[PDB]
Amino acid sequence: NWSVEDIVKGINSNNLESQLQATQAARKLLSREKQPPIDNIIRAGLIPKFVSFLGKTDCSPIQFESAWALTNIASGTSEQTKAVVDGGAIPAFISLLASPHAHISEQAVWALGNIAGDGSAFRDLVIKHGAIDPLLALLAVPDLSTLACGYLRNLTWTLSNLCRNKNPAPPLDAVEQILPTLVRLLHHNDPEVLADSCWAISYLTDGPNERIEMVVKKGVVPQLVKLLGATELPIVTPALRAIGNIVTGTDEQTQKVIDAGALAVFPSLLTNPKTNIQKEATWTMSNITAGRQDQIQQVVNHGLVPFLVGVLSKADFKTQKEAAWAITNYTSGGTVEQIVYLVHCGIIEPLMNLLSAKDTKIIQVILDAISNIFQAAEKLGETEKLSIMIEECGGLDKIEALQRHENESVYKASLNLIEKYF
């Protein structure tokens, strides 16, 4: 590898070919795994020279080498991405999207994804400079399979970064412009394209119900449910996040997920050996059980209540916390018969066992659930049958103890339970 001193000497020469060789040397230096000297390159003042090389239509190799050098600077810290932006790189890269050389266009796609991926402001600045139209034009072919696989993956990734980040979320008009191309990529037979399109949809559904509706209205929920069943974990993870985001919305949006067949996948998701999949599947279930009684009934009919008992009984603690939420939502919204059924599937003992957790929130959530179940037992006149039952698995003792507990609503709710029913 050249020294930065020698790179500067070549780039400052009055010889395009010497400048090209020094830019290639910079690209290779910036491409090394252990500790590329990005800040030294920036301090040498080389970004403005790279940016001017982007505009050299008559010398496509130096366009490519400087684009690659800038991509690797823009892939670093936010301060390093800012330095690239501050050199004027955004409009220069957008101009290269139309290049007849596919490797240059791809480099510009990559660079704009790094810049937009830095955060909301640079994302929106890339959009204001007009990146979306020429990016989408690169996919305006009748069959995506004629594109080079790596080229297509790069485009999908950059589009997903334009859908990414919040406060603010991407402009509504930009989302509507990008969404039809995302729908297409969601049906493309490449695992990495599918994964990144799912990530893009996961970003677009992470927000208010109006944002969810823009996605749901494009009809993608059945495809997301299909991708929930993929064997590739990199596909299932964002597809599940997208589905979980959608069921934070209205009852009608939640119903489209159920109508699409999503509940049939949850026996596997709720026992998945990847901890994060189990956690997000249980979180998703907790928002479905927060729904209407007929939606709780579909959870019942699909045999998913035993699986909720399972995750409550044994899972990573954060997953068990989501299961507690699922149970409190179920018993808050459910009919008496639905709550009786929950008790018949064995919810009481694992609920009580979690009262030993040193976590105030889950104790509150569980106490709420227990009160909800007693209210159903009152309507049936069977409060004592439930009391004896809490007693027999050791639940009374753990409720007694929380009378002596720091947090106020805990001992409040704990006290009331023992008074009224014990």
Binding site: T71, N72, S75, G76, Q107, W110, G117, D118, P238
Partner: peptide, 8 residues
């Protein structure tokens, strides 16, 4: 999903 990517 990776937020930024180095081309090696």
């Amino acid at each position: 999903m990776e937020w930024k990517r180095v081309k090696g």
